[PDB]
């Protein structure tokens, strides 16, 4: 089970440093090339750097030359990307990818990581407020009703929203965050459920914000009417 787990990303001041780690499992990085590629929010994939398996040769992009440094540990089986003098241009989700074997595939990156977010901003961290959007009593007695949660006034990205501790997936819609005028982020997560089960099934939304270490399990109940 080839997998890459990344870590070390977060909020960095404009000009600081940060070291991202990329642990591998199911294979040894000593026999493969490891690439780092970044993606700014709403932009395309940008190749950052790469390190080769038997020589340790490194290659960097013209926009991160000198500031960034890619490395790898065979004994710990983990790649690293040390970035210094970070600017707003470097705010992005960073992925580490394994360049597949030359017989099986070619020079393409067969396995990738889920990525880690790096925000280069001098703004501060704020935990979100979670409010229930209860199903309306006057909904014309439809077959299905809608209920959700509003996650408002937090910074920076991201928040993880689930339902029933990750038990309700079908019909769930977690809208992308919207940067409002207060510099904070706000989003909603709604779900469509049969209205005949609002009085029996308990619907709870679970919101996690790791940058502020705030977890909220907000129960959504329809108001008495």
């Amino acid at each position: 089970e080839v997998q890459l787990v990344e870590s070390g990303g977060g909020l960095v001041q404009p000009g600081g440093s940060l070291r991202l780690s990329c642990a591998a499992s199911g294979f040894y990085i000593s026999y493969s090339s490891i690439h780092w590629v970044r993606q700014a929010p709403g932009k395309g994939l940008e190749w950052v750097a790469s390190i080769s398996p038997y020589s340790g040769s490194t290659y960097y992009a013209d926009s991160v030359k000198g500031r960034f440094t890619i490395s790898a540990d065979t004994s710990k089986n983990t790649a690293y990307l040390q970035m210094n003098s970070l600017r707003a241009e470097d705010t992005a989700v960073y992925y580490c990818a394994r360049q597949g074997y030359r017989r099986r595939s070619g020079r393409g990156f067969d396995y990738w990581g889920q990525g880690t977010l790096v925000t280069v901003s001098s703004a501060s961290t704020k935990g979100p407020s979670v409010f229930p959007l209860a199903p309306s009593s006057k909904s014309t007695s439809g077959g299905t009703a809608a209920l959700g949660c509003l996650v408002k006034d937090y910074f920076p990205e991201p928040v993880t929203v689930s339902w029933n501790s990750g038990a309700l997936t079908s019909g769930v819609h977690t809208f992308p965050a919207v940067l409002q005028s207060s510099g904070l982020y706000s989003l909603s997560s709604v779900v469509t459920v049969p209205s005949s089960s609002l009085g029996t099934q308990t619907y709870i939304c679970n919101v996690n914000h790791k940058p502020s270490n705030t977890k909220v399990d907000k129960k959504v109940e329809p108001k008495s009417c």
């Binding site: 393409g108 396995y111 989003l187």
Partner: protein, 215 residues
């Protein structure tokens, strides 16, 4: 000079079962060391094509890749509802390796009217000192839609935000949220609040309203 790869088009929308081709032109000769990746919104890219003309093990046969000198074509013979993503070409001929601008492939669908719901501010939010009223447009197509807010039968502008989800991979629909934010004093100063939605799937603007303080 590094090797830039111009991808074409930047976006398209094809029907289910359609044959979609995406081209990628290299600035110079890159041999056959190009790859085609598929990336879901907020997800890790998957390797679809390696070595220009070879599909990665496990990729369905509907994906294919071809090379004509510096041009590289990624084809989908019969588009599927699960093929919604941004596709990228990446050269591995020399360092620094570069990607393409990307082609966000949309799935064309029959027009579907939205389901409109409205949510008044929570009591917890009223305790916090603000009031955000939410308007939900669920499961519709196409993505274009207009939402207006009426506070005591009066239009609002500038004090409302909106967000749009990505296409579902089983129905190719969209969902839109519209949040109108006010202070507690401004929310309590008025009475009725209405969300008016105009969409192509509707023959008349659908209005969902509520009187504050009443259920």
């Amino acid at each position: 000079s590094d090797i830039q790869m111009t991808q074409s088009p930047s976006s398209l929308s094809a029907s289910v079962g359609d044959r979609v081709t995406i081209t990628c032109r290299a600035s110079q000769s890159v041999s056959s060391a190009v790859a085609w990746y598929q990336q879901k919104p907020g997800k890790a890219p998957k390797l679809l094509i390696y070595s220009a003309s070879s599909l990665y093990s496990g990729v369905p046969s509907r994906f294919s890749g071809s090379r004509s000198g510096t041009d590289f074509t990624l084809t989908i013979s019969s588009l599927q509802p699960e093929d919604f993503a941004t596709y990228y070409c990446q050269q591995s001929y020399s360092f620094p390796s570069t990607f393409g601008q990307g082609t966000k492939v949309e799935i064309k669908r029959t027009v579907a009217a939205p389901s409109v719901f409205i949510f008044p501010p929570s009591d917890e939010q009223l305790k916090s000192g603000t009031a955000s009223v939410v308007c939900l447009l669920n499961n519709f197509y196409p993505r274009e839609a207009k939402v207006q807010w009426k506070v005591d039968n009066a239009l609002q502008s500038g004090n409302s935000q909106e967000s749009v989800t990505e296409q579902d991979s089983a129905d190719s629909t969209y969902s839109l949220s519209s949040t109108l934010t006010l202070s507690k004093a401004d929310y309590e100063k008025h009475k009725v609040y209405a969300c008016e939605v105009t969409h192509q799937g509707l023959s008349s603007p659908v209005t969902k309203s509520f009187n504050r303080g009443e259920c």
